[PDB]
Design a protein around this ligand. Structure first.
Ligand code: HEM
Ligand SMILES: [O]
Length: 153
């Protein structure tokens, strides 16, 4: 697909829509996650000892926000520049994943959880051209973090 001027315009537009509601979209995101894979729960300090996914836990919100931001930034950088750039932050990300017991097979869990979250976020404006655009941008960003975990192991 590439990432045409027209495709990037489509991701930016759809992310602005996500940030517009953090406590919802982030608690939804963790439920989509636990639906796709229940065992994932013991991983999260803020999920451990609990029985349900807390809805107003700042730790949880801060966490999930950071995750979508990073995927959007990735799409822009792809249209302008043609790539995703690896920095300090992505590198530290890779460390903390490993301390916490996270593996590669966990990633399609969080992808489908994000496509399904964005399909839910943009509703009727959904196009093939847009699905194509978020897919490209996640894929391209995961490729980069997985890279940094393996390196923190
Ligand atoms: C491109 C995809 C991903 C991005 C952009 C991302 C981003 C992040 C960030 C930014 C943090 C630190 C948050 C903090 O300091 O507050 C974090 C922590 C963490 N992540 Fe991920 N992540 C991704 C995929 C995954 C996957 C696939 C899993 C496994 C289910 C996972 C499990 C965790 C855990 C257990 C922590 C520690 C949280 C703690 O106990 O408090 N992440 N992630
Ligand atoms: O995460």
């Amino acid at each position: 697909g590439a990432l045409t001027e027209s495709q990037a315009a489509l991701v930016k537009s759809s992310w602005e829509e996500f940030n517009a509601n953090i406590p919802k979209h982030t608690h939804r995101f963790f439920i989509l996650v636990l639906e796709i894979a229940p065992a994932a729960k013991d991983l999260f300090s803020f999920l451990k000892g609990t029985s349900e996914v807390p809805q107003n836990n700042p730790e949880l919100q801060a966490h999930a926000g950071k995750v979508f931001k990073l995927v959007y930034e990735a799409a822009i950088q792809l249209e302008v520049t043609g790539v995703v750039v690896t920095d300090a932050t992505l590198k530290n990300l890779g460390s903390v994943h490993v301390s916490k017991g996270v593996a590669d097979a966990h990633f399609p869990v969080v992808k489908e959880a994000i496509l399904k979250t964005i399909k839910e976020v943009v509703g009727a404006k959904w196009s093939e051209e847009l699905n194509s655009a978020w897919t490209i941008a996640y894929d391209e960003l995961a490729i980069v973090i997985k890279k940094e975990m393996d390196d923190a192991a």
